[PDB]
Every structure is written in structure tokens, then in C-alpha cells.
């Protein structure tokens, strides 16, 4: 219906509100962006799903995301891959570990302060019935 065609709609707009917050922190500079094949050339092959803000913008606008459930997935996929492309105990690793969890705990912690949850449970009402 348009009722939940606007519904989606809404999600998308607080998407991409949430993200654009992510993606102006300085702190998560290095995951506004593909990481580039000429600066490293294994991480295509150690990662198998990159992830970066950049195409999470890309994926809420080709409405990939019905549920604020599937978009922290890739919030936590962005995540996840930083921690294992980036494991080591030097200071560089260390850095970009640290900035991973903190982008992480940023997204959970706006979503916790401004997503209505009976908003998230319609979202996934509507996905589970289609
Ligand atoms: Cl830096």
C-alpha cells in the first residue's frame, strides 16, 4: 500500500540521516570509501564482502534496506572487516580497531536514542509479509 510505501520511505530518510552523522566524523574517515586495489592489493581477496558508508548511502537509495535490522547488519559488517583486516597489536591496527567499534557503537547508540521501536517492528511486519 502507500501507507507502507511511505513507511519505507521514512526508514530511508532516517537512513540516510544516520549515516551522513557517521560519515562527517572525522573519526570514520577511513570508512567513507572503498579501500583502494592500488594502496593494498589483498584486501579483495581477504575480504569477501567490503563495506564502506559510501555504499550503504548507495544501497538505502537503491532500497535495499527494509528493516533497521539489515542496515546495522552492514554497519556491523563495516565493522567486522576492519577488525579483521586490521589485526595486529601496532599502534596503526590498534587505531583503526578502535575507530571501527566506536563507529559501530555510534549508530547503535543514535538508533537506541531516536528509532521508535514500535517504528523498527512495522518495518519488519511489512517485510515479513511480502
Ligand atoms: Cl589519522
Do not use: W
Not at 580497531?97 to 517492528?121: G, N, P, S, V, W
Amino acid at each position: 500500500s502507500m501507507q507502507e510505501e511511505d513507511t519505507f520511505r521514512e526508514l530511508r530518510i532516517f537512513l540516510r540521516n544516520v549515516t551522513h552523522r557517521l560519515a562527517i566524523d572525522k573519526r570514520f574517515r577511513v570508512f567513507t570509501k572503498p579501500v583502494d586495489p592500488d594502496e593494498v592489493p589483498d584486501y579483495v581477496t581477504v575480504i569477501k564482502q567490503p563495506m564502506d558508508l559510501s555504499s550503504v548511502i548507495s544501497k538505502i537509495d537503491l532500497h535495499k534496506y527494509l528493516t533497521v535490522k539489515d542496515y546495522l547488519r552492514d554497519i556491523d559488517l563495516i565493522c567486522s572487516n576492519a577488525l579483521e583486516a586490521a589485526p595486529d597489536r601496532d599502534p596503526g591496527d590498534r587505531l583503526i580497531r578502535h575507530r571501527a567499534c566506536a563507529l559501530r557503537d555510534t549508530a547503535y547508540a543514535i538508533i537506541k536514542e531516536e528509532l521508535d521501536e514500535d517504528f523498527e517492528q512495522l518495518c519488519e511486519e511489512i517485510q515479513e509479509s511480502r
